[PDB]
Every structure is written in structure tokens, then in C-alpha cells.
Symmetry: D2
Subunit: 30 residues, 4 copies
């Protein structure tokens, strides 16, 4: 079953989104 | 500046994505 | 099977992300 | 200003999320 792999692909995209959110906050602070 | 608020909206969506990824993994395990 | 419902929850989050991306571009243009 | 570039990075992640949602629906149908 590939479900678990697709769930890892989701987790990686969530991590990338959170990194971009931190990046935007830092851009705003500067 | 609204940037910081938009970055919080992103962080909330990232959290929701990670919760759905954990949910999918649990669905796969069951 | 709930997979299809979880895939709709993903689609809704993707739509929200794209709306926020358009919002950020408009903030940048202004 | 980098805002516009960061908004493109968001748009790309939203597109990837929607592709994964379609993929999950197809996995469910099969």
C-alpha cells in the first residue's frame, strides 16, 4: 500500500509551508 | 503591516496539513 | 472508505493556500 | 522585494497539494 508514502509526501509539503511561514514572519520583522 | 497575520494563517494551514498526514498514516496502518 | 473525504479536506486546504498566495502577491504589488 | 517570489513558492506548494489530493482520490477509486 502506497498510502503511507503519500502521507510522507504530505508531511514534507507541511514542513515546507511552515518554513515559508517563518520566512514571511522574518521578512515582516525586518 | 498584515504580513505577520498572513504568516499565521499559513502556519495554521501547515498544522492542518500535518494533522491530515498523520491521519492518513493511521488510516493506512489500520 | 473515508479516503475520498480526506482527499476533499486536502483539496480545500490547497485552495486556501492558493488564495493566500494571490493575497500575498497583491500585498506586494500595493 | 522578495514577497512576490515567496508567493510563487506558496503557489507551487498549493499546486503540489492539489495534485496529491487528486492522487489520493484515484487511489481510493481503485
Amino acid at each position: 500500500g502506497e498510502l503511507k508514502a503519500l502521507a510522507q509526501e504530505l508531511k514534507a509539503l507541511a514542513k515546507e509551508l511552515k518554513a515559508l511561514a517563518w520566512e514571511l514572519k522574518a521578512l515582516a520583522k525586518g
